[PDB]
Design an enzyme around this catalytic site. Structure first.
Site, PDB file in Angstrom:
ATOM      1  N   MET A 111       0.790  -1.174   0.000  1.00  0.00           N
ATOM      2  CA  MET A 111       0.000   0.000   0.000  1.00  0.00           C
ATOM      3  C   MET A 111       0.851   1.264   0.000  1.00  0.00           C
ATOM      4  O   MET A 111       1.782   1.401   0.786  1.00  0.00           O
ATOM      5  CB  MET A 111      -0.894   0.002   1.210  1.00  0.00           C
ATOM      6  CG  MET A 111      -1.593   1.320   1.403  1.00  0.00           C
ATOM      7  SD  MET A 111      -2.723   1.343   2.782  1.00  0.00           S
ATOM      8  CE  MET A 111      -1.551   1.410   4.129  1.00  0.00           C
ATOM      9  N   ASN A 112       0.539   2.194  -0.898  1.00  0.00           N
ATOM     10  CA  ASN A 112       1.080   3.527  -0.756  1.00  0.00           C
ATOM     11  C   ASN A 112      -0.018   4.571  -0.630  1.00  0.00           C
ATOM     12  O   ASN A 112      -0.855   4.447   0.254  1.00  0.00           O
ATOM     13  CB  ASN A 112       2.228   3.879  -1.749  1.00  0.00           C
ATOM     14  CG  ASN A 112       1.892   3.606  -3.213  1.00  0.00           C
ATOM     15  OD1 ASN A 112       1.963   2.459  -3.698  1.00  0.00           O
ATOM     16  ND2 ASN A 112       1.582   4.674  -3.941  1.00  0.00           N
ATOM     17  N   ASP A 113      -0.003   5.581  -1.500  1.00  0.00           N
ATOM     18  CA  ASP A 113      -0.932   6.693  -1.455  1.00  0.00           C
ATOM     19  C   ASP A 113      -2.368   6.322  -1.118  1.00  0.00           C
ATOM     20  O   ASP A 113      -2.910   5.381  -1.705  1.00  0.00           O
ATOM     21  CB  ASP A 113      -0.949   7.381  -2.809  1.00  0.00           C
ATOM     22  CG  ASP A 113       0.336   8.068  -3.131  1.00  0.00           C
ATOM     23  OD1 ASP A 113       1.435   7.482  -2.941  1.00  0.00           O
ATOM     24  OD2 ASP A 113       0.223   9.217  -3.583  1.00  0.00           O
ATOM     25  N   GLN A 135      -3.381   2.995  -3.231  1.00  0.00           N
ATOM     26  CA  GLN A 135      -2.476   2.360  -4.163  1.00  0.00           C
ATOM     27  C   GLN A 135      -2.105   0.948  -3.669  1.00  0.00           C
ATOM     28  O   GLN A 135      -1.490   0.746  -2.596  1.00  0.00           O
ATOM     29  CB  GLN A 135      -1.248   3.241  -4.383  1.00  0.00           C
ATOM     30  CG  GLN A 135      -1.631   4.650  -4.811  1.00  0.00           C
ATOM     31  CD  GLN A 135      -2.228   4.679  -6.201  1.00  0.00           C
ATOM     32  OE1 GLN A 135      -3.448   4.730  -6.372  1.00  0.00           O
ATOM     33  NE2 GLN A 135      -1.370   4.586  -7.197  1.00  0.00           N
ATOM     34  N   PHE A 138      -3.572   4.855 -10.772  1.00  0.00           N
ATOM     35  CA  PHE A 138      -2.663   5.621  -9.935  1.00  0.00           C
ATOM     36  C   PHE A 138      -3.416   6.414  -8.867  1.00  0.00           C
ATOM     37  O   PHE A 138      -4.547   6.090  -8.551  1.00  0.00           O
ATOM     38  CB  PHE A 138      -1.756   6.487 -10.816  1.00  0.00           C
ATOM     39  CG  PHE A 138      -0.478   5.815 -11.217  1.00  0.00           C
ATOM     40  CD1 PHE A 138      -0.417   4.444 -11.384  1.00  0.00           C
ATOM     41  CD2 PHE A 138       0.671   6.560 -11.451  1.00  0.00           C
ATOM     42  CE1 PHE A 138       0.789   3.826 -11.755  1.00  0.00           C
ATOM     43  CE2 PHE A 138       1.875   5.938 -11.825  1.00  0.00           C
ATOM     44  CZ  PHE A 138       1.930   4.583 -11.977  1.00  0.00           C
ATOM     45  N   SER A 139      -2.791   7.422  -8.276  1.00  0.00           N
ATOM     46  CA  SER A 139      -3.487   8.204  -7.272  1.00  0.00           C
ATOM     47  C   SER A 139      -4.638   9.008  -7.864  1.00  0.00           C
ATOM     48  O   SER A 139      -4.673   9.225  -9.086  1.00  0.00           O
ATOM     49  CB  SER A 139      -2.536   9.094  -6.481  1.00  0.00           C
ATOM     50  OG  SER A 139      -2.090   8.433  -5.309  1.00  0.00           O
ATOM     51  N   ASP A 148      -2.469  12.500 -10.292  1.00  0.00           N
ATOM     52  CA  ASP A 148      -2.928  12.661  -8.884  1.00  0.00           C
ATOM     53  C   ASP A 148      -3.856  13.830  -8.669  1.00  0.00           C
ATOM     54  O   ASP A 148      -3.471  14.813  -8.039  1.00  0.00           O
ATOM     55  CB  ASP A 148      -1.783  12.687  -7.849  1.00  0.00           C
ATOM     56  CG  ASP A 148      -0.557  11.911  -8.309  1.00  0.00           C
ATOM     57  OD1 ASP A 148      -0.733  10.949  -9.092  1.00  0.00           O
ATOM     58  OD2 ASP A 148       0.571  12.297  -7.920  1.00  0.00           O
TER      59      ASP A 148
END
Ligand SMILES: OC[C@H]1O[C@@](CO)(OC[C@@]2(OC[C@@]3(OC[C@@]4(O[C@H]5O[C@H](CO)[C@@H](O)[C@H](O)[C@H]5O)O[C@H](CO)[C@@H](O)[C@@H]4O)O[C@H](CO)[C@@H](O)[C@@H]3O)O[C@H](CO)[C@@H](O)[C@@H]2O)[C@@H](O)[C@@H]1O
Ligand SMILES: OC[C@H]1O[C@@](CO)(OC[C@@]2(OC[C@@]3(OC[C@@]4(O[C@H]5O[C@H](CO)[C@@H](O)[C@H](O)[C@H]5O)O[C@H](CO)[C@@H](O)[C@@H]4O)O[C@H](CO)[C@@H](O)[C@@H]3O)O[C@H](CO)[C@@H](O)[C@@H]2O)[C@@H](O)[C@@H]1O
Ligand SMILES: *[C@@H]1O[C@H](CO)[C@@H](O)[C@H](O)[C@H]1NC(C)=O
Ligand SMILES: *[C@@H]1O[C@H](CO)[C@@H](O)[C@H](O)[C@H]1NC(C)=O
Ligand SMILES: *[C@@H]1O[C@H](CO)[C@@H](O)[C@H](O)[C@H]1NC(C)=O
Lengths: 512, 512
Positions: free
Chosen positions: A25-27, A45, A87-88, A156
């Site tokens: 996991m990111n953003d 993400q 993406f974000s 984003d």
């Protein structure tokens, strides 16, 4: 695309900081509040397949009603080919069906639309998608993309409804041009460029922008706050979040001043995003790690938590002795729906090397918090001692107690963390800074004596500090030896006379 | 009144970084070049009486002809009462006697005037003084102060001759108002306020401003560069230096953009000031420490060195892969007048764990330097190994070799330092950051492969790094155990195949 038999949750997985069950996991993405389901949504993400960032890349999904009890759900969105990624991006609730996806059989407060960056080999566009079932499954628009400028670096977007200009606004980052771009649309499908914005610390890349109205405290009045994330080239190394405070007319953001200020001076607070549909205040959370070493930390079979959600205001605060500045203030979200397992409370105590404050609890959950207001007294002491410290110790394993320190030095007017832990080695720990500090002015003067405050909350692998009632915040991860996790908490000092008086203290054991 | 029988110069005193013989030095002051005596001048905040900052506070004095051989002289200036101190400030050479202190019998290039902050209990003013003997002794004006605004926080003026507006300019900090103030005067005695300037990172206090014309490389053109120091509350902790690049007319500085950029992302580079009268280029040095721990470091009977002097230019450099930015470049000053004691030179070498590069010199002076160009190859390796490291080792004493590391990680595109040394403990080392990194874009692509460069020079207790030909600089002190100082230098890695090719390598032993 590994995984296996190794699981560290026992001592590594936070309890009240969201965490994907397995993978990467990111953003955080698509943050909104569902007024009719009275339900909080979080997307992210997500690479389910690996312990690191990879395509295909998806928007994960999980809901909460209280912002600390998360339920993970099936993926909300995926890409067409293994080659690509969602993406974000953000979510908005299309009350008046400007978008036209929405029947009469769909609650206005459930008319969800997501705007996200569609990442193709050599292309990145702004695409949108809608959910009919309250945010759980999505349908691509059909005439996606809705914004394409022939760019490989354009991603984003945070989107919102601007009454005053009667349109949908978009802050999206022209990543390597260091522009935040501001589009408007009455439609969510057709977009007109309004302005570009370049400011603050550049770093290597602008990313995950954000623009929102934040209430000045004790007042009818508010300001318009532009968030911005940068990675790499944070002056602290890696990744960080920053802001600007000013005025929006729906076409351009004008900062009141031109200073650079950071949202969190810890090492692990990137890609902050606020919640849509919040009735009362500004609420947000970030990704609680640093791109320098996020994919190498010793957690398995997931990696990364988010921060707690925080409540955001603006307060006039003293930055030196003469001058106050309008300043972003953030405090954590903790509902009473959180079990207090056990607690130590104390009142008006003098701190000296013979009066320590030792937590003596029955056992541990690895979820602690601590809430302290203190006075700095007039007492001259040798320079090595103008500090007190909070030690957050693990249980003894290989006959050794892993600990992390949080102190304040009166001679420096600055708090500090030391997250060093011996014998725990992982890739890229050359960038894993161990010592960070924050200079603050007094919260208050009680007579001539100075008064400071600090709330911190430790969660198996992450620690959040809020200084002087949320005037500065400092998020940082920490990695103890296999099997070890916080057990007890001390507040100690080396001075023989009292240099610090603790007006109030509350150390708590917490649970789900 | 401490001082005594303890002297660490043996292993602690730098050789080519100016140092007071005994006592306390911070901000460097009155920097100028004497064209007729062909002689470089350095003055400084000096307390001769203690190992820490105290009043009475004086301007120290020393000269050089080559900028690395320093001769200490009798104090240039002191205060009237033990109550006060001559704070920071600058020097100008009054060619055409606008000031009127100057006979016909005094060389125009020796018509020295100092402008300095006079600090009284509850008052701080801008005062001036002249020297008849080429800068060694001073006489106070007589109608001092020349600027007084009834302020307790108003200090540190840099002054210069602006041809284009035909006047003397003064950048002085209204310290806790976060204004740099721009006064003009034809006289040096009478002063008119022209503008205020507030920008960049605020911290707790603006200090030691600077404005000067820096030449853009390979070109007729130049820009006007605003320097600024801030302490405390550097985002890195404590103290730091920052800049802005724009345009001056004699009345206001306009930055081209509104970004925040730092002059040296190391921990120990504060109170930078440039030399007056330099014929060709911009030259300067700073105080080489951090206010968080400067008075607690284990050097006796002095504390603090300066940095090397550095040559300052502006270059178009790639900050990401798409965009270049006009960017302050700085490279160190080293005349050939510096002994090479011994050196190791190497060409086109492939780095692997079996081919290390060990310095094998006869003995040590503790003054080394290293100059490296390198290529990053296409070879996939496990994440723990995408780095190479320069180890700067002491001689073995209590059977233990004190070392400090300088590396580069290809996966991060970032250089790094780790100045940790065990068993050496001093007050406020909680703020003594050990790990710092700098992200850089390639200097050059040789084909598809990436090329980076780094010169570093070690000096008994200080290390200066310049990445990619002076695109970023990183100054940092270091404190090895009693008696220990650099002896040898290695360039190692853990990878089995070559990941790094060292196009060139030159490790040097240096001397006075
Ligand atoms: O999810 C997309 C989304 O995230 C945002 C906000 O952060 O930007 C992401 C972005 O940068 C990520 C970055 O680091 C990734 C990292 O490792 C992964 O990538 C490598 C290949 O690029 C793989 O080898 C590795 O195994 C992956 O885990 O890169 C380093 C490896 O050298 C690791 O230290 C990191 O964990 O990707 C680039 C390339 O390294 C870095 O500079 C970044 O820090 O992702 C894309 C490209 O990956 C880039 O455009 C973004 O900046 C947001 O903008 C997007 O919405
Ligand atoms: O000499 C003035 C000259 O230098 C400049 C540029 O830096 O301004 C310096 C300035 O701040 C100094 C500061 O640090 C000093 C420090 O210790 C000394 O001062 C104390 C007296 O207030 C003593 O307690 C101590 O023993 C002295 O050695 O302060 C800390 C002690 O708590 C130590 O960590 C430092 O070594 O002083 C304040 C107060 O702590 C700090 O915040 C600063 O970092 O000097 C005066 C006050 O000293 C202040 O107005 C300046 O900003 C330049 O601007 C001047 O021209
Ligand atoms: C903003 O930037 C875009 C992309 O570079 C460009 O096409 C447009 O000219 C800019 N518009 C304004 C108003 O600056
Ligand atoms: C900490 O203490 C203050 C003082 O009562 C209280 O108002 C606050 O809610 C406490 N908890 C947090 C998280 O700030
Ligand atoms: C700058 O600020 C000072 C402080 O009050 C004020 O006197 C002055 O008028 C300002 N000057 C200008 C030119 O803005």
């Amino acid at each position: 695309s590994i995984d296996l038999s190794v699981d560290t949750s026992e001592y590594n997985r936070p309890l009240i900081h969201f965490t994907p069950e397995k993978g990467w996991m990111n953003d955080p993405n698509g943050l909104f509040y569902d007024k009719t389901a009275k339900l909080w949504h979080l997307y992210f993400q997500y690479n389910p397949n690996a312990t690191a960032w990879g395509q295909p890349l998806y928007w994960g999904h999980a809901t909460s009603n209280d912002l600390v009890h998360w339920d993970e759900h099936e993926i909300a969105i995926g890409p067409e080919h293994d080659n690509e990624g969602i993406f974000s991006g953000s979510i908005v609730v299309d009350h008046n069906n400007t978008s036209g996806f929405f029947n009469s059989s769909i609650d206005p407060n459930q008319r969800i639309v997501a705007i996200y960056t569609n990442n193709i080999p050599d292309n990145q566009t702004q695409d949108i998608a809608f959910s009919l079932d309250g945010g759980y499954t999505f349908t691509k628009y059909e005439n996606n993309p809705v914004i394409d400028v022939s760019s490989n670096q354009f991603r984003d977007p945070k989107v919102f409804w601007h009454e005053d200009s009667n349109q949908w606004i978009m802050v999206v980052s022209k990543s390597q041009e260091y522009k935040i771009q501001i589009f408007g649309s009455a439609n969510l499908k057709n977009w007109v460029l309004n302005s570009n914005f370049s400011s603050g610390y550049y770093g290597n890349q602008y990313a995950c922008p954000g623009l929102i109205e934040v209430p000045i405290e004790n007042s009818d009045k508010s300001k318009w706050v532009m968030f911005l994330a940068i990675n790499p080239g944070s002056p602290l190394g890696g990744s960080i979040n920053q802001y600007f405070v000013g005025d929006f007319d729906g076409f351009q953001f004008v900062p009141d001043d031109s200073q650079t200020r950071f949202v969190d001076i810890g090492k692990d607070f990137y890609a902050f995003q606020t919640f849509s549909e919040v009735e009362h205040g500004v609420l947000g959370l970030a990704w609680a790690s640093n791109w320098q070493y996020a994919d190498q930390v010793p957690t398995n079979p997931w990696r990364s938590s988010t921060s707690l959600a925080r409540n955001y205001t603006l307060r006039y605060v003293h930055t030196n002795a003469e001058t106050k500045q309008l300043t972003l203030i953030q405090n954590p979200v903790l509902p009473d729906s959180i079990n207090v397992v056990d607690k130590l409370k104390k009142k008006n105590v003098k701190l000296t090397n013979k009066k320590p404050i030792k937590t003596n609890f029955k056992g541990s959950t690895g979820l602690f918090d601590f809430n302290i207001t203190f006075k700095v007294l007039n007492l001259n002491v040798s320079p090595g001692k103008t500090h007190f410290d909070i030690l957050i110790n693990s249980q003894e394993l290989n006959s050794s107690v892993d600990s992390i320190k949080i102190g304040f030095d009166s001679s420096q007017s600055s708090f500090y963390i030391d997250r060093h832990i011996p014998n725990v080695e992982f890739p890229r720990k050359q960038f894993f800074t161990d010592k960070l500090a924050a200079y603050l002015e007094p919260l208050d003067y009680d007579q001539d004596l100075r008064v400071f405050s600090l709330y911190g909350i430790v969660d198996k692998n992450i620690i959040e500090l809020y200084f002087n009632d949320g005037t500065v915040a400092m998020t940082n991860t920490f990695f103890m030896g296999e099997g070890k996790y916080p057990h007890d908490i001390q507040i100690v000092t080396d001075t023989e006379e009292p240099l610090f008086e603790l007006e109030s203290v509350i150390i708590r054991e917490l649970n789900k």
